[PDB]
Design a protein around this ligand. Structure first.
Ligand SMILES: Cc1cc2nc3c(=O)[nH]c(=O)nc-3n(C[C@H](O)[C@H](O)[C@H](O)COP(=O)(O)O)c2cc1C
Ligand code: SF4
Ligand code: SF4
Ligand code: SF4
Ligand code: FES
Ligand code: FES
Lengths: 62, 206, 439, 65, 214
């Protein structure tokens, strides 16, 4: 998909265990296994992706 | 820049706009009790001792940092102000220690003077018999400045002076809540040509 | 009628909601949350048009929506956003979306991130246009590391799809969203303190004036706005300010989430119309008090920071920003903490005070110690060792603290003890009485 | 006994006045020699704004609170 | 026991070498740039987070490292690194059990779970085993008041708990086996127990309830 998922690193483990945590999965109704699939370093890995897109920052000092 | 007209204590007063309430009250002549405010330091609201009531005030305002606005009415010595000041000093004097006789600022201490003028005279703090007060380890800071931080009131005069006037930048605050302390997180010496002036700034004998 | 002035409502029975009217449909996560389901549930619909409308449009329909900010203070957002919309300066205007859920008893904020992060992002975009925001920052507790990543993921899908960024939704206007996971501390839920957090300073709040509309992050014009306040916004601009006035009774307009917890059979979060009786709600979406309605000692409607109300006064309470104010309590976050007839309310409240004592930056004279004092007094009361005059200390100390502190936290610490003395003083008298007799 | 002996009578002598011209008038009438010491010029207003603590460009941004 | 004054201990001292590993170095470069050029000091808290996350706790050398990155006095980093609660300035350990012992978690019995935790780990509050596998801790509220009682372990949210399951959870973590976070009583996410009473209808779809004009 053109709107891909975040980088494979940012994803703790590729969902293959289906039921995760309290019983989330792409099948079952509580469809948010992605929440329970976040790594110790998932946050930082996200911004590593986001070097690509973000626009120029304002600068006070000229 | 035309000067605003404001009735400080039922007296018309002239202030260039943006003037702070306190800076106007001195202009006329009245003085508000301050602890964290000094002429030559950045403005902060810490002590809450400079509070004052303005007619139709939902909230008493800190004169030290309150820019005056048109047609106000500042009631310096109105009972609501007196209620506020006493409460604030009951607070300050909860857990200040009982060390006036051994405190080098005895008889020169703003806390004593402003306690006399504007504070109460009875101790509602009953917990001295149950769990006592708080205490803080003193710091080693140099061969010049003797430090007894268990008297500090966290006015941040030392913090602001060092950061700005001397630019040492090595003296600051730490921690939340009643356990907030001041000093350097690790033992250092506050070495600086102007370091003496902190002794005059600290209103209390810390 | 003028551009503002939301239309008064003429309904008496503000009963349940219709799930069509529930804006947060995915709440409880029965359906997909990624951008596939989101655009299947209508999460980015005609955003290009609405954004193009301008700021005058958006602010106006907000005004006639009469929305009161759900951040706990309750001041309406239309005026807030309008202040941002004042040009005549070369500043990088910013928009801060406070997602702090520090408020004890409150859990609604968490699930918006966990189940509809796209909705919030869309809302920030529409609002950010109305605030002329150069960019925005979604400040979030450090206790929600998994949510923060989840939001980061939603930002990924949005950036990749081109919904948000430069030329977002093809409108040409630029807007980027960043995620700042502040190292958890309850005080950061304050506007000024949060701004200090983002800036990297100590974290303690600031005096007002100046307001964030004057100077905010980086000394730039900003507003801190609650997550729900933002999340509803795009739906309002997409569904009609008239319709949102269709709910609510008066100035307390719109709908709000509720978090029912405590001695409750089936506590949970419920989207439901405001201006509702509390008893009806507790028996509709909640199942009722564990010991039945009679076995009820008191409810704290706004969660912590809010005085308790006893069962008798509670029996007929209209839940809303108003109404409760008359009943001597503030709706806060609509966080209802309910306790059965049998539990130590006094040491329940003592726990709240300890929370404040541990959660108070310590910049103001009253709050750096006065809560510390209240903690000492309440602890002694809980153990039953205190002269009855300490009833008056707590009453009279509380008045001294309230109003003199900088951030509203002091008031949040002052009110609960005031409520306890007003309504459950006989309990304290008995607790002290038992100790004295044994003494 | 190592006290601070002083055989000079007008050592502690100290009097107050409302304005220097009054004092000079008094001092002459009692035939003393004197020399005024100009106190100070009127305090020049200092802006002492709160917002300067938080500025985007100016150096005056506070390092801490 | 928490101290806002640091002494040069053998285990915590600037002499210890800390440095950002190449993986984190990239992240540091990427994260710095979300702040305008003038004010880079705002990134400090994320940087301290990353350092703690890499190391497991904050050594004073790490605070120096962040200060060196941002070119500011070492005291300012100390100020913040001491303010925020979870910036553990002492050796934490592998797992950091956090129990929210405030209302309404206290109301739902969360004293029980804390009592058991001390029993089985063998140490009291604010403590860590000689192993450092475990660290008991109390926190005010973890934003899961609704799923009360509840515990968190360094990322995790274990809610809807009791003495029985905490015993099981600790035996699991004693064995060092992965545990499934989230509630373990039948619900999943802040949803009323049993059958559902609201949002029982399919989401309408895009455009529903549009203004129909403007
Ligand atoms: C001590 C304290 C804690 C606060 N915590 C929160 C919070 O956790 N979540 C929130 O949305 N607002 C919180 N607020 C209020 C926010 O600072 C601010 O009022 C809110 O964003 C208002 O937004 P709104 O009026 O548009 O809804 C807190 C205020 C104080 C004084
Ligand atoms: S600082 Fe003032 S009040 Fe405190 S011990 Fe010294 S003289 Fe007494
Ligand atoms: S040490 Fe002195 S100057 Fe510094 S905050 Fe304390 S009382 Fe104020
Ligand atoms: S009221 Fe309390 S928490 Fe708020 S700024 Fe003052 S001391 Fe800090
Ligand atoms: S002088 Fe105003 S708060 Fe201290
Ligand atoms: S006190 Fe347990 S999550 Fe709030």
């Amino acid at each position: 998909s053109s709107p891909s998922v975040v980088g494979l690193t940012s994803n703790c483990v590729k969902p293959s265990s289906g039921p995760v945590g309290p019983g989330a999965s792409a099948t079952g109704g509580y469809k948010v296994p992605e929440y329970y699939s976040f790594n110790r370093f998932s946050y930082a890995e996200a911004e590593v992706e986001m070097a690509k897109y973000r626009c120029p920052q304002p600068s006070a000092l000229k | 820049p035309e000067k605003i007209e404001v009735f400080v204590d039922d007296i018309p007063v002239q202030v260039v706009p943006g003037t702070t309430v306190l800076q106007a009250a001195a202009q006329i002549g009245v003085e508000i009790p301050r602890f964290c405010y000094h002429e030559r330091l950045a403005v902060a609201g810490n002590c809450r001792m400079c509070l004052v009531e303005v007619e139709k005030s939902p909230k008493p305002v800190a004169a030290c940092a309150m820019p005056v606005m048109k047609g106000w009415r500042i009631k310096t010595n109105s009972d609501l102000t007196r209620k506020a000041r006493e409460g604030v000093m009951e607070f300050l004097l909860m857990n200040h220690p009982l060390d006036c006789p051994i405190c080098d600022q005895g008889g020169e201490c703003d806390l004593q003077d402003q306690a006399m003028a504007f504070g109460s005279d009875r101790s509602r703090f009953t917990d001295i018999n149950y769990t006592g007060k708080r205490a803080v380890e003193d710091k080693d800071i140099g061969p010049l400045v003797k430090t007894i931080m268990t008297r500090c009131i966290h006015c941040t005069r030392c913090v602001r002076f060092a950061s700005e006037i001397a630019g040492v930048d090595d003296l600051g605050t730490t921690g939340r809540g009643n356990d907030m302390q001041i000093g350097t997180y690790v033992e250092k010496l506050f070495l600086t040509e102007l370091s003496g002036n902190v002794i005059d700034l600290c209103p209390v004998g810390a | 009628p003028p551009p503002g002035t939301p239309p008064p409502q003429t309904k008496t029975k503000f009963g349940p909601l219709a799930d069509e009217d529930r804006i947060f449909t995915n709440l409880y996560g029965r359906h997909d949350w990624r951008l596939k389901g989101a655009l299947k549930r209508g999460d980015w619909y005609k955003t290009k048009e609405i954004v193009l409308k301008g700021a005058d449009w958006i602010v106006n329909e907000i005004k006639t929506s009469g929305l009161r900010g759900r951040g706990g203070a309750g001041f309406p957002s239309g005026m807030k956003w309008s202040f941002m919309n004042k040009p005549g300066d070369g500043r990088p205007k910013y928009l801060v979306v406070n997602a702090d859920e520090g408020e004890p008893g409150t859990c609604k904020d968490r699930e918006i991130m966990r189940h509809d992060p796209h909705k919030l992002v869309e809302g920030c975009l529409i609002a950010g246009r109305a605030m002329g925001a150069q960019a925005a920052y979604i400040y979030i507790r450090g206790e929600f590391y998994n949510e923060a990543s989840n939001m980061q993921l939603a930002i990924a899908e949005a950036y990749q799809a081109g919904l948000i960024g430069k030329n977002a939704c093809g409108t040409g206007y630029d807007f980027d969203v960043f995620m700042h996971r502040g190292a958890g501390a309850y005080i950061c839920g304050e506007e000024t303190a949060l701004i200090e957090s983002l800036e990297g300073k100590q974290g303690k709040p600031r005096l007002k004036p100046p307001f964030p509309a004057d100077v905010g992050v980086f000394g730039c014009p900003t507003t801190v706005t609650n997550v729900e306040t933002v999340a509803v916004a795009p739906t309002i601009c997409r569904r009609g300010g008239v319709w949102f006035a269709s709910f609510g009774r008066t100035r307390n307009s719109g709908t709000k989430l509720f978090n029912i917890s405590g001695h409750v059979n089936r506590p949970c979060t419920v989207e439901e119309e405001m201006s509702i009786p509390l008893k009806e709600l507790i028996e509709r979406h909640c199942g009722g008090v564990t010991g039945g309605w009679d076995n009820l000692l008191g409810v704290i409607p706004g969660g912590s920071s809010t005085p308790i109300i006893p069962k008798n006064v509670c029996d007929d309470v209209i839940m809303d920003f108003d109404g409760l104010i008359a009943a001597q309590t503030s709706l806060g976050t609509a966080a209802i903490i309910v306790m059965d007839k049998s539990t130590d309310v006094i040491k329940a409240i003592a726990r709240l005070i300890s929370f404040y004592k541990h959660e108070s930056c310590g910049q103001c004279t009253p709050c750096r110690e006065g809560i510390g004092w209240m903690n000492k007094i309440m602890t002694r009361f809980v153990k039953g060792d205190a002269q009855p005059a300490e009833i008056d200390m707590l009453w009279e100390i509380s008045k001294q603290i309230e109003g003199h502190t900088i951030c509203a936290l002091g008031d949040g610490a002052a009110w609960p003890v005031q409520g306890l003395i007003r309504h459950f003083r006989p309990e304290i008298e008995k607790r002290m009485q038992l100790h004295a007799k044994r003494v | 006994m190592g006290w601070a002996s002083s055989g000079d009578p007008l050592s502690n002598m100290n009097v107050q006045f409302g304005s220097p011209e009054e004092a000079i008038t008094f001092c002459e009438r009692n035939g003393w020699r004197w020399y005024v010491d100009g106190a100070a010029k009127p305090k020049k207003e200092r802006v002492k704004n709160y917002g300067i603590n938080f500025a985007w460009n100016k150096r005056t941004r506070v390092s801490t609170k | 026991d928490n101290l806002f004054v640091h002494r040069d201990t053998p285990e915590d001292n600037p002499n210890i070498p800390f440095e950002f590993t190449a993986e984190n170095k990239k992240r540091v470069e990427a994260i710095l740039s979300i702040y305008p050029e003038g004010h880079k000091r705002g990134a400090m808290i994320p940087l301290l987070d990353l350092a703690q996350r890499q190391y497991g706790w904050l050594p004073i050398s790490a605070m120096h490292k962040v200060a060196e990155i941002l070119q500011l006095p070492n005291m300012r980093v100390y100020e913040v690194a001491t303010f925020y609660t979870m910036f553990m300035r002492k050796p934490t350990g592998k797992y950091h059990i956090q129990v929210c012992t405030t209302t309404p978690c206290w109301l739902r019995g969360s004293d029980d779970i804390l009592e058991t935790c001390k029993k089985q780990l063998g140490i009291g509050v604010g403590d860590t085993t000689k192993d450092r596998k475990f660290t008991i801790s109390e926190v005010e509220c973890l934003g899961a008041c609704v799923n009360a009682p509840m515990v968190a372990i360094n990322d995790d949210y274990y809610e809807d708990l009791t003495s029985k399951d905490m015993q099981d959870i600790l035996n699991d973590l004693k064995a060092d086996k992965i545990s499934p976070p989230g509630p373990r009583n039948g619900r999943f996410a802040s949803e009323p127990k049993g059958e559902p009473t609201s949002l029982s209808e399919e989401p309408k779809g895009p455009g529903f309830g549009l203004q129909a004009g403007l």
